[PDB]
Design a protein around this ligand. Sequence first.
Ligand SMILES: [Cl-]
Ligand SMILES: [Zn+2]
Ligand SMILES: [Zn+2]
Ligand SMILES: [Zn+2]
Ligand SMILES: [Zn+2]
Ligand SMILES: [Zn+2]
Length: 340
Amino acid sequence: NEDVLVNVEGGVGLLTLNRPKAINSLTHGMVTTMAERLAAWENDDSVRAVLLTGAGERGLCAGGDVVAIYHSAKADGAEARRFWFDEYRLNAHIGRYPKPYVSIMDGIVMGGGVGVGAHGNVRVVTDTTKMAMPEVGIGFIPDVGGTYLLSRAPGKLGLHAALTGAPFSGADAIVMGFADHYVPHDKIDEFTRAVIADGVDAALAAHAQEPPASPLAEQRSWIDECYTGDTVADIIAALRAHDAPAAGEAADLIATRSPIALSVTLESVRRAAKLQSLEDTLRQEYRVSCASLKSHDLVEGIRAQLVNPKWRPATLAEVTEADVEAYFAPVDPELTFEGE
Ligand SMILES: [Cl-]
Ligand SMILES: [Zn+2]
Ligand SMILES: [Zn+2]
Ligand SMILES: [Zn+2]
Ligand SMILES: [Zn+2]
Ligand SMILES: [Zn+2]
């Protein structure tokens, strides 16, 4: 099997993620294929644009392959670090890319799938889009430039998405700055065909629609009320005190997540909000990911997903400021972006 299908048609470089039985989860091989093709096509005049899609019907991409990260974290972390090094460089390159990069973020789009789709410049979601950064549920922290996107969402919507790790819709994704355009699922095929035949602007004019109401946008009042707290424990207390079902549901979900991952996530998004550069943000995320490889909760979190995680530390009250600060320590080598 070719885990990424590659072709050029109508002047469009086509990248189709192709592990549909795994909802197209990303391997290191898939990342390097994408990266090499983006590099090869960048100065090739026969390629006017790039289009990223996923095979099958359930989603563009459910994430990075978590089994491989798990096996690496139990070993010496070498593959995980190399994977993230190459992946984050790819994320940055999509972010800078000079040619139109159209991503079809249909169906399930989570974690690493956000990384390959949501830094594009023509970002399409649909009525089946279920997008999330669910990292705290496995003892991890949103990466792949997710902290850059989360910190740029309106209000505190980004913190809500990051701490709950809950999915949000296509319309929500547009509100949060993770996507640009809305096309119903049973027009993606016509839309994709039109990009290839008539170009991006014609395809959009012909198939894009006004998104429906964003439920996340309607929740902004209590999100902004409750997520201004200094600590995750402050946030949970406020959500409970607001005494309404949607806030309570958020609190309940947060309370299932890794305490250390939640704490590092809150700090990451707050620090990312002060960084202008996608590259600088990814450098921070790389330190955090590297640190997470040495953690109890990353292994426990992924284990539980594969096989009720028992987090350690078990409570937010046991998380110290030094525990959080440890995730932001320098590493050697730092993530670098040269070789363009
Ligand atoms: Cl570039
Ligand atoms: Zn379909
Ligand atoms: Zn393995
Ligand atoms: Zn590798
Ligand atoms: Zn470039
Ligand atoms: Zn169709």
